[PDB]
Amino acid sequence: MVVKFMDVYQRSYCHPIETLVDIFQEYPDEIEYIFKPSAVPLMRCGGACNDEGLECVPTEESNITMQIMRIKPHQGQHIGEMSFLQHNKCECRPKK
Amino acid sequence: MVVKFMDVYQRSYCHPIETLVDIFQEYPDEIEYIFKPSAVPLMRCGGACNDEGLECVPTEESNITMQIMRIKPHQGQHIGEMSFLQHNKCECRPKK
């Protein structure tokens, strides 16, 4: 079959999407660590907007705490809680 | 609460993930066109593997056809069918 355009557009439109997010990218100051897993799944805004003058951005957010394996040379592996930001609501906004 | 490590790793482990994929990326030979929506959601392999000599790749795939709006600046627009690859099964394999 074929997905009809209106259906394709609505499902591709700006909304919260579970996304794999690199841990080190979120915690840029932890330069001595390697994390396992290296990326975790987090709800993040993504998708289209009606006119190019707009971008998909969060209008509501919250945090989630996860146990992450933190590995630094000579310190063996540690399992530690790390907090990550999630997007609960998304809307199209003018590119500032 | 806190998501326990075993669950964190399991949810982060190589598997098919609904991913927003840039159409022009899947069809880089379609220069003249602006697609709308510019990206669509497709199931794509993503996630961690146990050791770094491995990468998450598809081991079963399929196709999905969607009606996409094709725009040629100052030339009008057409709604047309476009085929996209989908990943149905993923596995961690050597980075040959």
Swiss-Prot record, chains A, B:
Induction: By hypoxia. Regulated by growth factors, cytokines, gonadotropins, nitric oxide, hypoglycemia and oncogenic mutations. Disulfide bonds join 14-56, 45-90, 49-92. Glycans are attached at residue 63. Higher expression in pituitary tumors than the pituitary gland. It is linked to Microvascular complications of diabetes 1: Pathological conditions that develop in numerous tissues and organs as a consequence of diabetes mellitus. They include diabetic retinopathy, diabetic nephropathy leading to end-stage renal disease, and diabetic neuropathy. Diabetic retinopathy remains the major cause of new-onset blindness among diabetic adults. It is characterized by vascular permeability and increased tissue ischemia and angiogenesis. Belongs to the PDGF/VEGF growth factor family. This is Vascular endothelial growth factor A, long form. It comes from Homo sapiens.
